[PDB]
Design an enzyme around this catalytic site. Structure first.
Site, mmCIF file in Angstrom:
data_model
loop_
_atom_site.group_PDB
_atom_site.id
_atom_site.type_symbol
_atom_site.label_atom_id
_atom_site.label_comp_id
_atom_site.label_asym_id
_atom_site.label_seq_id
_atom_site.Cartn_x
_atom_site.Cartn_y
_atom_site.Cartn_z
ATOM 1 N N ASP A 1 0.844 -1.216 0.000
ATOM 2 C CA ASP A 1 0.000 0.000 0.000
ATOM 3 C C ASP A 1 0.875 1.260 0.000
ATOM 4 O O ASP A 1 0.646 2.200 0.767
ATOM 5 C CB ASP A 1 -0.981 0.006 1.195
ATOM 6 C CG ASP A 1 -2.014 1.139 1.118
ATOM 7 O OD1 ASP A 1 -2.376 1.572 0.007
ATOM 8 O OD2 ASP A 1 -2.452 1.623 2.181
ATOM 9 N N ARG B 1 0.273 9.338 0.922
ATOM 10 C CA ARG B 1 -0.452 9.439 2.188
ATOM 11 C C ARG B 1 0.218 8.606 3.286
ATOM 12 O O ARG B 1 0.160 8.959 4.459
ATOM 13 C CB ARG B 1 -1.906 8.994 2.007
ATOM 14 C CG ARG B 1 -2.074 7.497 1.819
ATOM 15 C CD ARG B 1 -3.523 7.108 1.568
ATOM 16 N NE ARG B 1 -3.620 5.711 1.162
ATOM 17 C CZ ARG B 1 -3.387 5.286 -0.073
ATOM 18 N NH1 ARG B 1 -3.061 6.147 -1.017
ATOM 19 N NH2 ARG B 1 -3.478 4.000 -0.370
ATOM 20 N N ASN B 2 0.858 7.511 2.887
ATOM 21 C CA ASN B 2 1.566 6.621 3.818
ATOM 22 C C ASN B 2 2.975 7.080 4.212
ATOM 23 O O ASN B 2 3.447 6.767 5.300
ATOM 24 C CB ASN B 2 1.671 5.214 3.218
ATOM 25 C CG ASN B 2 0.355 4.466 3.246
ATOM 26 O OD1 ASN B 2 -0.107 4.039 4.304
ATOM 27 N ND2 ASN B 2 -0.248 4.285 2.077
ATOM 28 N N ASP C 1 3.776 2.581 7.516
ATOM 29 C CA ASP C 1 2.640 1.635 7.395
ATOM 30 C C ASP C 1 2.916 0.425 6.482
ATOM 31 O O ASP C 1 2.008 -0.105 5.838
ATOM 32 C CB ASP C 1 1.363 2.370 6.935
ATOM 33 C CG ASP C 1 0.771 3.261 8.006
ATOM 34 O OD1 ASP C 1 0.846 2.912 9.203
ATOM 35 O OD2 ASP C 1 0.193 4.307 7.645
HETATM 36 C C1 LIG Z 1 -1.638 12.853 6.144
HETATM 37 C C2 LIG Z 1 -1.751 13.445 7.550
HETATM 38 C C3 LIG Z 1 -1.707 14.915 7.528
HETATM 39 N N1 LIG Z 1 -1.677 16.072 7.506
HETATM 40 C C4 LIG Z 1 -0.701 12.915 8.506
HETATM 41 O O1 LIG Z 1 0.296 13.590 8.740
HETATM 42 N N2 LIG Z 1 -0.956 11.794 9.198
HETATM 43 C C5 LIG Z 1 -2.292 11.298 9.553
HETATM 44 C C6 LIG Z 1 -2.392 11.336 11.072
HETATM 45 C C7 LIG Z 1 -1.279 10.520 11.716
HETATM 46 C C8 LIG Z 1 0.070 11.035 11.228
HETATM 47 N N3 LIG Z 1 1.231 10.263 11.728
HETATM 48 N N4 LIG Z 1 1.143 8.870 11.711
HETATM 49 C C9 LIG Z 1 2.316 8.395 12.186
HETATM 50 C C10 LIG Z 1 2.576 7.031 12.326
HETATM 51 C C11 LIG Z 1 2.513 6.229 11.190
HETATM 52 C C12 LIG Z 1 2.658 4.844 11.286
HETATM 53 C C13 LIG Z 1 2.867 4.241 12.529
HETATM 54 O O2 LIG Z 1 3.010 2.881 12.670
HETATM 55 C C14 LIG Z 1 3.736 2.078 11.820
HETATM 56 C C15 LIG Z 1 3.235 0.811 11.516
HETATM 57 C C16 LIG Z 1 3.940 -0.035 10.656
HETATM 58 C C17 LIG Z 1 5.148 0.373 10.098
HETATM 59 C C18 LIG Z 1 5.651 1.631 10.401
HETATM 60 C C19 LIG Z 1 4.957 2.486 11.262
HETATM 61 C C20 LIG Z 1 2.925 5.043 13.668
HETATM 62 C C21 LIG Z 1 2.770 6.425 13.569
HETATM 63 F F1 LIG Z 1 2.839 7.160 14.687
HETATM 64 C C22 LIG Z 1 3.140 9.498 12.474
HETATM 65 C C23 LIG Z 1 4.441 9.680 12.974
HETATM 66 N N5 LIG Z 1 5.264 8.657 13.313
HETATM 67 N N6 LIG Z 1 4.918 10.942 13.134
HETATM 68 C C24 LIG Z 1 4.175 12.022 12.820
HETATM 69 N N7 LIG Z 1 2.932 11.891 12.341
HETATM 70 C C25 LIG Z 1 2.412 10.653 12.164
HETATM 71 C C26 LIG Z 1 0.113 10.936 9.703
HETATM 72 C C27 LIG Z 1 -2.944 12.802 5.316
HETATM 73 C C28 LIG Z 1 -2.663 12.086 3.990
HETATM 74 C C29 LIG Z 1 -3.376 14.227 4.929
HETATM 75 N N8 LIG Z 1 -4.028 12.036 6.010
HETATM 76 C C30 LIG Z 1 -5.437 12.489 5.888
HETATM 77 C C31 LIG Z 1 -6.375 11.824 6.900
HETATM 78 N N9 LIG Z 1 -6.081 10.397 6.896
HETATM 79 C C32 LIG Z 1 -7.045 9.603 7.657
HETATM 80 C C33 LIG Z 1 -8.449 9.572 7.075
HETATM 81 O O3 LIG Z 1 -8.303 8.180 6.765
HETATM 82 C C34 LIG Z 1 -6.966 8.127 7.274
HETATM 83 C C35 LIG Z 1 -4.722 10.105 7.324
HETATM 84 C C36 LIG Z 1 -3.849 10.579 6.175
#
Ligand SMILES: */C(=C(/C#N)C(=O)N1CCC[C@@H](n2nc(-c3ccc(Oc4ccccc4)cc3F)c3c(N)ncnc32)C1)C(C)(C)N1CCN(C2COC2)CC1
Length: 268
Positions: A130, A134-135, A148
């Site tokens: 995937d 976005r990932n 992810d």
């Molecule tokens: C992107 C968002 C914006 N603006 C965006 O920045 N994010 C969505 C909210 C969470 C944010 N974020 N996630 C992590 C993170 C990712 C992955 C993991 O775990 C794993 C698992 C397996 C392998 C590796 C990692 C842990 C996490 F904490 C973040 C980290 N580490 N740091 C900072 N921020 C993090 C990412 C967009 C595309 C705009 N967005 C729109 C709304 N979407 C939701 C609606 O359906 C999904 C999310 C995506």
């Protein structure tokens, strides 16, 4: 507890980072010292038995352009996945932000970063499944990292996993996935091609004029993404090479890295 297990008592939730793919995400501190991001795997969304075993292999993966996995919390629910905090968030948003006025040099550097991460995943025979903008995550230094990865493997809802599903990533998928559910290293190659397009289109949605079912139809029938304005002929060739109908004719991530580095040298 286990080698990658983190004690929840060592964590402290401070800020909301929003809902991510497959779970809620919070910013916090680990052992009151390190900045971390914690994704809480929504209870019952995953096949926990298989998911916990596959996470152990996932945790052992080590690369500069892969988001650093600090640890897991598997003894309670929801399961936590603890990672490094990436201050610039998801790449899609980083690209779309119009205060950022990118040069193509920076766009090609983003492609290299991901291609290095994906070359490493390929060397470990670990499929992302995937890959998209976005990932991908961006740190304070502007370095893009893959995230992810392998996480769609055991999502229980069939709408995410089935090629004909309503939440399936059709726009990042090759014909063999859409028609025959055939994932491989070459399906990751295809997706990386679409990611290159996303980057060079400054976060535009692939095949935006079509719906997901319309897109699915057109990909199987031979539709490929046009050349973005910012992409040169040589850059377009690289992303286009990822979209051969025959999977075996697509390059490896090693070859794609070599192609990017050649362009980088001439570009200067
Ligand atoms: C992107 C968002 C914006 N603006 C965006 O920045 N994010 C969505 C909210 C969470 C944010 N974020 N996630 C992590 C993170 C990712 C992955 C993991 O775990 C794993 C698992 C397996 C392998 C590796 C990692 C842990 C996490 F904490 C973040 C980290 N580490 N740091 C900072 N921020 C993090 C990412 C967009 C595309 C705009 N967005 C729109 C709304 N979407 C939701 C609606 O359906 C999904 C999310 C995506």
């Amino acid at each position: 507890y286990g080698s990658w297990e983190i004690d929840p008592k060592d964590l402290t939730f401070l800020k909301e980072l929003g809902t991510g793919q497959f779970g809620v995400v919070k910013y916090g501190k680990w052992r009151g010292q390190y900045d971390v991001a914690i994704k809480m795997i929504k209870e019952g969304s995953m096949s926990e038995d298989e998911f916990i075993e596959e996470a152990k292999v996932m945790m052992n993966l080590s690369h500069e352009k892969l988001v650093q996995l600090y640890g897991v919390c598997t003894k309670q629910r929801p399961i936590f996945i603890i990672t490094e905090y990436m201050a610039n968030g998801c790449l899609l948003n980083y690209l779309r932000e119009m205060r950022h006025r990118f040069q193509t040099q920076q766009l090609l550097e983003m492609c290299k970063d991901v291609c290095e991460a994906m070359e490493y995943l390929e060397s470990k025979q670990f499929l992302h499944r995937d890959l998209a903008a976005r990932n991908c995550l961006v740190n304070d230094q502007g370095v893009v990292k893959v995230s992810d990865f392998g996480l769609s493997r055991y999502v229980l809802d069939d709408e995410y996993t089935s090629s004909v599903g309503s939440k399936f990533p059709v726009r990042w998928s090759p014909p063999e996935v859409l028609m025959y559910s055939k994932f491989s290293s070459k399906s990751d190659i295809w997706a990386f091609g679409v990611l290159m397009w996303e980057i060079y289109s400054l976060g535009k949605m692939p095949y935006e004029r079509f719906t997901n079912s319309e897109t699915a139809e057109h990909i199987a029938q031979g539709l490929r993404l046009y050349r973005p304005h910012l992409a040169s002929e040589k850059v377009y060739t690289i992303m286009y090479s990822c979209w051969h109908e025959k999977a075996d004719e697509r390059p490896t991530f090693k070859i794609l890295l070599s192609n990017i580095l050649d362009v980088m040298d001439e570009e200067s």
